[PDB]
Design a protein around this ligand. Structure first.
Ligand code: HEM
Ligand code: HEM
Ligand code: HEM
Ligand code: HEM
Ligand code: ZN
Ligand code: ZN
Ligand code: ZN
Ligand code: ZN
Lengths: 106, 106, 106, 106
């Protein structure tokens, strides 16, 4: 899908996690986020459609996703360890990464 | 693309890296590997077409990519730091991850 | 050294990075933070001096550092790639990790 | 402690993990390895006592530990998820990292 969609996914499951009750939910949600993130990856953001594919910006843009995915990956682990609360914390702190990118490229 | 393709990509650039001379090459090759890995991600391997999307296996399968991608990501950094040799080492040691997955799901 | 010290180090270089001008500075500062974090690691926080060494808390406490170190490591890479700005961003976003631990154990 | 010691620690718990039966053991052992690794970190290897602290080698040397610790961190997660076998696999594959450093600096 396109950015807007994967981003909608990202934001939806994030709220699902915040309202989540069981570790089952959190896991599934995070899993979708990973997918959404990995997909958002390939995309080229509007503010950067004039920049070349191998631009310092496009590279930093892609780097952001590697950070985001790495984080989800870990939060995932926590959910898998049954630790629902600290997994949610992990998800909440993800926002820092979401935001970060938004300033630079949204 | 489909697994076979992204896997071909993955294996080709790996050898490109082993035969690589300049940091420029390694970078580019690793970059391609990231793309191939991230894509291979979405795919569902043959040995697991009967297993549900949220199977312990399908999840572990996906996890391997997170490891692989993470590793490529760091190798990438090394290449960007001009450190061609240790980046190649990083690439060589990636194999451990490639193999790992192959036993369980290839 | 002891927590307070390594923590002071951590917070000092963090501001050094924020006021940093050249990539050389950022690198050096981040390098100090790595050392400081790696050291703070071994330590046992006050709120947890009654808890056993292998407590869920002492483990989570240790995990936080693994996250922090991991992040510093990557920020370091960026600095080495000459990318001073996104390296600073990487540092700023570290705080999320700093904070996270402080709620739970400070 | 000094390198030799942390290294002994590292190699001992590794074998403990290989002979390990319950997830409890694996966790505890890996935890010791982390401590041993993080400590080995600060040290200055013999082959590099003539090189300056900020040498390309001393830096690469330190980087190796960041890789090792990172890996241990993940194995740790697997143990915590009860997955004793794949955690042991994680541990076995760590050796690739152990070796790597030994060629360059042992
Ligand atoms: C889990 C974290 C994240 C969440 C929940 C999130 C959420 C959102 C949401 C809800 C939008 C709404 C606007 C729309 O698409 O119509 C948006 C847009 C956007 N996000 Fe994020 N985001 C996250 C991470 C990131 C990261 C890491 C990057 C950069 C690498 C990024 C780049 C963008 C961009 C470029 C847009 C503009 C899309 C457009 O053209 O409409 N986001 N984000
Ligand atoms: C850089 C590391 C890797 C390399 C170089 C690599 C390479 C290859 C190659 C050359 C094939 C050839 C057979 C073909 O596709 O026709 C293959 C197949 C396969 N690989 Fe990898 N691989 C890597 C990592 C991984 C990882 C991490 C996983 C698991 C998460 C994985 C899963 C598979 C599977 C399931 C197949 C079978 C594909 C098919 O149906 O043909 N690989 N791989
Ligand atoms: C780069 C991020 C971090 C910065 C800049 C930072 C900074 C600080 C500072 C300035 C103090 C001042 C109080 C003092 O020590 O006298 C402090 C205390 C403390 N920090 Fe951090 N911290 C960071 C990360 C962390 C992390 C990840 C943990 C947990 C694993 C942690 C645990 C603590 C604890 C337990 C104290 C109390 C120390 C005491 O007994 O005085 N910090 N931190
Ligand atoms: C878990 C993986 C590792 C294991 C099990 C391991 C194990 C060992 C063992 C058993 C020795 C025995 C010699 C002695 O100390 O008397 C040794 C030496 C050494 N290892 Fe490792 N090691 C590991 C990782 C590393 C890494 C990542 C580095 C580099 C960053 C490294 C650097 C060294 C060095 C420099 C020595 C020489 C110490 C001396 O002066 O005696 N090792 N290692
Ligand atoms: Zn973790
Ligand atoms: Zn690295
Ligand atoms: Zn990075
Ligand atoms: Zn993992």
């Amino acid at each position: 899908a396109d950015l807007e969609d994967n981003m909608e996914t990202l934001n939806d499951n994030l709220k699902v996690i915040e309202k989540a009750d069981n570790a089952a939910q959190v896991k599934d949600a995070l899993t979708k986020m990973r997918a959404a993130a990995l997909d958002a990856q390939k995309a080229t953001p509007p503010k950067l459609e004039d920049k070349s594919p191998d631009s310092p910006e496009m590279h930093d843009f892609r780097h952001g996703f590697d950070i985001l995915v790495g984080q989800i990956h870990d939060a995932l682990h926590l959910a898998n360890e049954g630790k629902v609360k600290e997994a949610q914390a992990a998800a909440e702190q993800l926002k820092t990464t979401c935001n970060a990118c938004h300033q630079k490229y949204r």
